């Protein structure tokens, strides 16, 4: 298991552009491509909107894709979007300290997040972070359930929260 195997299970895999649970049209292996619009909003600004997706999803290939890629292309994205998320924990001057501090399977896990919700949001759970840190780890499960993040993604936190927990890749075994 690693975090290529462990987002791959957290993510999935669709071929076509779809609507994540925030409201986002996604595509490949949890590729974020822009904002979906009001499920009224008006049959002209959903076509607009669908349109704006497929354009971000062009630029991103480099091709006339139509809201459709490969599997070849779906792992492209995966391994650029892996490689930013990494980055972004270094250059963040809150998350940086916290992955220094955590062993690998740790490590593996804080990514996950930060591939899920960006460096900005991840940075800001403060007090979760401290007891990271400071490696009070049922503090920290305890604490990252209080979140929109559980709530909304349970199944998910939840591996993630019992990653940190134990140290381990338990939850994604047999998975
Ligand atoms: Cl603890």
Redesign the pocket.
């Known amino acids: 298991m690693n975090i290529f195997e462990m987002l791959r299970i957290d993510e999935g895999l669709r071929l076509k552009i779809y609507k994540d649970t925030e409201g986002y049209y996604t595509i490949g292996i949890g590729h974020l491509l822009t904002k979906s619009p009001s499920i009224n909003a008006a049959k002209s600004e959903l076509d607009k909107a669908i349109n704006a997706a497929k354009s971000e999803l062009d630029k991103a290939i480099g091709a006339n894709t139509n809201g459709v890629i490969t599997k070849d292309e779906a792992e492209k994205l995966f391994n650029q979007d892996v490689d930013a998320a990494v980055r972004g924990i270094l250059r963040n001057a809150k998350l940086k300290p916290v992955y220094d501090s955590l062993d690998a399977v740790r490590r593996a896990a804080l990514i996950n997040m930060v591939f899920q919700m960006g460096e900005t949001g991840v940075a800001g759970f403060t007090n979760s972070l401290r007891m990271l840190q400071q490696k ?4 920290a499960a305890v604490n990252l359930a209080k979140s929109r993040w559980y709530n909304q993604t349970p199944n998910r936190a939840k591996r993630v929260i019992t990653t940190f927990r134990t140290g381990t890749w338990d939850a994604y075994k047999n998975l």
């Open positions: 009070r780890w049922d503090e």
